[PDB]
Amino acid sequence: AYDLSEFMGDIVALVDKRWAGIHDIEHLANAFSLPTPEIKVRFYQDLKRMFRLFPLGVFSDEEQRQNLLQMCQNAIDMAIESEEEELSELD
């Protein structure tokens, strides 16, 4: 059970973090328990896009806004690589 008010609370806490990092973003995704690597890549693309359209008011600093959007970007890159690794071997 991942309530809407819970996810909004995770976002509030994420945007409140000074110098968030890549795991703080993956934490958000795990709460959704996404069943597939390509859906996870989508998640991070659509997340970054969402955060990037947020008004400047909700963030602490333009620097923390940029940091947060850079970590999203690193998360998308991580998710892509991970998608590739799963497809890199036949088994």
């Binding site: 909004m8 947020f54 008004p55």
Partner: protein, 202 residues
Amino acid sequence: ARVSDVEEQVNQYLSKVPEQNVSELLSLLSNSPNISLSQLKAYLEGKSEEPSEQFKMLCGLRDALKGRPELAHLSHLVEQALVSMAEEQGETIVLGARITPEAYRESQSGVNPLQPLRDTYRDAVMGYQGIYAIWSDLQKRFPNGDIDSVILFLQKALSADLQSQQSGSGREKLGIVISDLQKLKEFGSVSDQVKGFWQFFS
């Protein structure tokens, strides 16, 4: 002694909401003189959740017992109770008395109840834990209420606090709650986008 102190602050605030079970508890207590302090305290907890109200009734009982010394003692307990509350709960009591008038008004509309209002103010002043904690507590307390109106209620109340406060850390800590509540208001503005995302991926 410390009891007079807290009592002084309580009535200054709580005369504005004139709202006498003191009789009903007289007779209930007169019958069965064989009570512990922990029974008395639990009884009052049952009568009201709010510490300032429990405190208040005890001051009422201490008084109505001015005329009923019929070896009606274990009124000794009433003063033991009062001292426990003043020493252990003074600040909680005073904060609850202070916010009662405002909380009562806000509770009027049916939608935001009195006690979660009181509690919310009190926790913001006495053990604030950050913006995530206060958000989570708002949601837990007001799941069918108007959380926007709660935030407003809190901003008004904390801003008044700030007018009479001015020393240092109390003042800083009030400011931080206030800024956090300002941010929760900013975030409201993005609630439909967040829902859109949440709905796709959940």
